[PDB]
Amino acid sequence: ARLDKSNFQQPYITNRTFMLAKEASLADNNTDVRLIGEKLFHGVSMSERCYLMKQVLNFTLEEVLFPQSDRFQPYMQEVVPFLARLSNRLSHIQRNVQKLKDTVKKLGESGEIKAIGELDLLFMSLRNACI
Amino acid sequence: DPSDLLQHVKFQSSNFENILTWDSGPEGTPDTVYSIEYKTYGERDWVAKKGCQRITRKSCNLTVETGNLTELYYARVTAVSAGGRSATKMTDRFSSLQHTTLKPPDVTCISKVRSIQMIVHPTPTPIRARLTLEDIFHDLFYHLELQVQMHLGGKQREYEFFGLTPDTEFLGTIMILVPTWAKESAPYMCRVKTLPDRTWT
């Protein structure tokens, strides 16, 4: 449904999140495929966006950040618990999320790296949708 | 060996004016020209920037080419030396919303006898639809401080600090904040004096 504005008003953790995405994007050589933007919200109302980003967030935690928990330290170990708290707070949509899952899968391990590199986009979409 | 011909290939971005910049590497060489291309993250085709082909200058203004606030971008620079040695190097992924620096706001500081009025002017940008910072960042607000320390803040444009001694000098500082993007401008500062109080008996 909703996330409080105070979750997004903390420069240290916002910056670490951006820093995590930056580091992963450095390992992402695929400039041709963007995961989060655009298509993801096609057919979804503004009021449904927060719930969509919950699903995307929980996918990313469980299938992306988990397998890659060793990478991109020390940012990973600080940022994941933050994103996990946001998930705990939130505790056709399926169609759009499945496409993102498919794309990550098609790209292989590089798709998981791509998703981590797009955490800036996930985080700011979460912010826009949920506040 | 690209790093030997090219280094620090990066966008410098302020209030959404986005200039690609680079320097030459250690390995040479005075006989070198550069050619710039750009692309949108998530698209396939690179585009040559007209006016930045085989240049000797080390920057290229890509403001409009990177002015869609919903996209992210890359640029690349290809160096070619007169001996035929060549290198290409790409920027990191560019996100104007995240990466652009906010300039200090233009502010009007007006003196009264027992107050200072401050008017923050909206910041125009090169973003075309021209949008201001205020149009772009919905949670933008101003932080104002008057050293005498009084503080005021909000989304509104004009503020007045009351209760000041007449004929006295103060220093005001005004900064833009966008808490959600962890963004802050350097402050604009004004040193002004309250007007004299001519009151007679």
**CATH number of the domain enclosing B4:** 2.60.40.10
**End position of a domain, from candidates B84, B101, B118:** B101
How far is the CA of A124 from the CAs of A115, A120, A127, B147, B181, in angstroms? 14, 6, 5, 36, 8
Taking the alpha carbons of A96, A17, B155, B177 in that order, is the dihedral positive or negative?
A: negative
B168 and B150 part of one domain: yes
Other Cβ atoms closer than 10 A to A86:
19
- Test B92 with A25 for CB contact under 8 angstroms: yes
B43 and B31 part of one domain: yes
Cβ(B11)–Cβ(B89) under 8 Å? no
Q: Count H helices and E strands in chain B, helices first.
A: 2, 15
Cβ(B20)–Cβ(B99) under 8 Å? no
Cα Rg of chain A (Å, integer):
14
B3 and B93 part of one domain: yes
Comparing alpha-carbon positions, the chain B residue that sits nearest to A128 is B180
**End position of a domain, from candidates B49, B69, B101:** B101
Domain ranges, residue B164: 102-201
Comparing alpha-carbon positions, the chain A residue that sits nearest to B44 is A32
**End position of a domain, from candidates B42, B72, B101:** B101
Q: What is the resolution of this structure in A?
A: 1.9
- Test A18 with B93 for CB contact under 8 angstroms: no
- Test A38 with B97 for CB contact under 8 angstroms: no
Overall number of domains in chain B = 2
- Distance between A36 CA and the closest CA of chain B, angstroms: 10
Comparing alpha-carbon positions, the chain A residue that sits nearest to B140 is A9
B28 and B120 part of one domain: no
- In 3D space, the residue among B172, B163, B156, B168 whose CA is nearest the CA of residue B193 turns out to be B168
Please name the method used to determine this structure: X-ray
B111 and B97 part of one domain: no
B65 and B80 part of one domain: yes
- Test B180 with A120 for CB contact under 8 angstroms: no
- Test A26 with B92 for CB contact under 8 angstroms: yes
Instruction: Catalogue all structural domains in chain A, each as residue range(s) with its CATH number.
Output: 1-131 (1.20.1250.10)
Interface test with chain A among B46, B70, B93, by most A beta carbons within 10 Å: B93
How far is the CA of B39 from the CAs of A65, A106, B45, B99, B142, in angstroms? 28, 23, 6, 17, 35
- In 3D space, the residue among B70, B75, B143, B46 whose CA is nearest the CA of residue B104 turns out to be B143
Q: What's the rounded Cα separation, in Å, for the pair A7 and A82?
A: 9
Q: What's the rounded Cα separation, in Å, for the pair A122 and B137?
A: 17
- Test A22 with B92 for CB contact under 8 angstroms: yes
Cβ(B39)–Cβ(B45) under 8 Å? yes
B25 and B113 part of one domain: no
